[PDB]
C-alpha cells in the first residue's frame, strides 16, 4: 500500500524504543530531506539511522536509491548513503574496497565526531573513520534490512517494485511475515530462516502494531502497523555487533 516510509510516522512509532532524534534536527530534516533528494538524482531518500559517538555530534545517516534490479538471484538496490552531524547539510559516503572492508571490521570501539579521524592497525595501516562508518552501515544493512513479505514484486525487465495491491501480512507476530529486502519476491526466504534467537517480535494485537527488534544488532528496530499498513525501520546506537548471543540468550 505505502510506497516509502515516512520520517514522522517512523519517529512516532519508534519513540518508545529510544529511537528519537532532536527536535531542531527534526525540523532540519523536514526541510533538508527534499533538498538532497532533488540535488542528487534519487527518487526515494529516507532516514536510515543515527549512530552515536564520543562527542554529542551523532551521525545521522540517510539512504537513497534510483534503480532496484534483480541480479543473480538477489534483489539488489544501487543504494547511496549520506551522513550529517545536523539535519541541515549532508555529505556523501563513498563505498570502500575489499582490503579496507576487511581491515575496517577489526576496529571495535565507539566512533569519534570528526570524520577526518584516522585509526591505526598492524607496519601500520592508516584507515579513515568514514570508511569504518560505511563498513558498519553496510554490515547492519546486510544483516537487518527488514520489510514485510510480498511487499515487493517483479515486473518486466526484472525490477523489484512496490506491490501496490499488498493487503498486509496475516499473523504479524510470526517472523514468517517479514523478510530481508534483498530476498527475491518469489523466494520463500524470511527472517525465520535466520538464526532462531536473533529476532524478537512484540505484537500489540489490540492497536494492531508489531515491533521487531534485532538482538544480534541490539539497536535496530522495525515497526509495522497493520490497520494503516505502514512499516518503517530505524537504527539508534552504535554499529557494533553482539558476538556472544549464545550466553545472553
Amino acid at each position: 500500500v505505502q510506497l516509502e516510509p515516512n520520517i514522522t510516522l517512523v519517529l512516532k512509532h519508534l519513540a518508545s524504543c529510544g529511537a528519537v532524534v532532536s527536535a531542531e534536527q527534526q525540523a532540519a530534516l523536514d526541510h533538508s530531506i527534499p533538498i538532497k533528494r532533488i540535488e542528487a538524482g534519487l527518487r526515494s531518500l529516507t532516514l536510515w539511522g543515527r549512530l552515536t559517538t564520543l562527542n554529542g555530534k551523532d551521525y545521522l545517516v540517510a539512504e537513497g536509491y534510483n534503480v532496484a534490479s534483480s541480479k543473480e538471484g538477489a534483489a539488489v538496490y544501487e543504494t547511496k548513503y549520506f551522513y550529517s552531524q545536523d539535519g541541515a547539510r549532508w555529505s556523501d559516503l563513498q563505498p570502500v574496497d575489499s582490503e579496507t572492508a576487511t581491515r575496517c571490521a577489526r576496529i571495535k570501539g565507539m566512533l569519534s565526531g570528526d570524520p577526518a579521524k584516522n585509526y591505526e592497525l598492524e607496519l601500520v595501516f592508516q584507515i579513515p573513520e568514514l570508511a569504518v562508518l560505511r563498513c558498519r552501515v553496510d554490515a547492519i544493512a546486510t544483516a537487518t534490512s527488514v520489510i514485510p513479505t510480498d511487499s515487493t514484486i517483479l515486473n518486466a525487465a526484472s525490477q523489484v517494485v512496490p506491490n501496490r495491491l499488498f493487503a498486509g501480512a496475516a499473523y504479524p507476530e510470526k517472523l514468517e511475515s517479514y523478510q530481508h529486502r534483498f530476498s527475491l519476491p518469489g523466494s520463500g526466504v524470511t527472517l525465520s530462516q535466520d538464526l532462531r534467537g536473533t529476532w524478537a517480535v512484540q505484537y500489540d494485537a489490540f492497536k494492531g502494531v508489531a515491533q521487531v527488534r534485532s538482538l544480534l544488532f541490539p539497536g535496530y528496530f522495525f515497526y509495522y502497523a497493520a490497520n494503516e499498513l505502514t512499516w518503517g525501520s530505524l537504527y539508534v546506537g552504535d554499529g557494533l555487533r553482539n558476538n556472544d548471543l549464545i550466553f545472553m540468550l
Binding site: 538464526l195 532462531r196 534467537g197 558476538n243 556472544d244 548471543l245 549464545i246 550466553f247 540468550l249
Partner: protein, 107 residues
C-alpha cells in the same frame, strides 16, 4: 567416594592419593557436574553440565595451574544454541563459527 567438607562429592577412581581415571564430581552450591577423565586429581576431558541442561563438552586444563576449560563446544539449553570454539587467553572465548541450533552432547 570422597565427600569434601564443602559438600562437593567425588565418585570414581583414585590412584596414589588423587583423583584418576573415570570420575564424576558434583559441586555443592552451583549444581554443576564434571564428568569424565581425571588425571592427578584434576579434570582433563569430558562434559561440564549446569543445573538446567546447558553444558560444555571438550578438553579442559588438567591439574596444571587450573582446571579451566580450554577447547570444545558450548550448548545452552535455554536457546538450544551450540557453538564450537576455544578460550584464547584471559578468559576471552573465541568461536570458530556462528552459533547454530543443535542438541545436547550425549556421548
Amino acid at each position: 567416594t570422597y565427600t569434601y567438607p564443602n559438600g562437593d562429592i567425588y565418585q570414581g577412581a583414585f590412584w596414589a592419593g588423587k583423583r584418576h581415571g573415570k570420575g564424576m564430581y558434583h559441586y555443592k552450591g552451583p549444581c554443576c557436574q564434571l564428568v569424565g577423565d581425571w588425571a592427578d586429581g584434576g579434570f582433563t576431558y569430558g562434559r561440564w553440565v549446569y543445573a538446567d541442561g546447558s553444558m560444555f563438552m571438550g578438553k579442559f586444563g588438567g591439574a596444571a595451574a587450573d582446571s579451566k576449560p580450554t577447547a570444545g563446544s558450548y550448548f545452552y539449553s535455554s536457546s538450544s544454541l551450540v557453538q564450537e570454539g576455544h578460550f584464547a587467553k584471559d578468559g576471552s572465548w573465541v568461536g570458530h563459527r556462528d552459533p547454530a541450533v543443535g542438541k545436547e552432547f550425549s556421548v
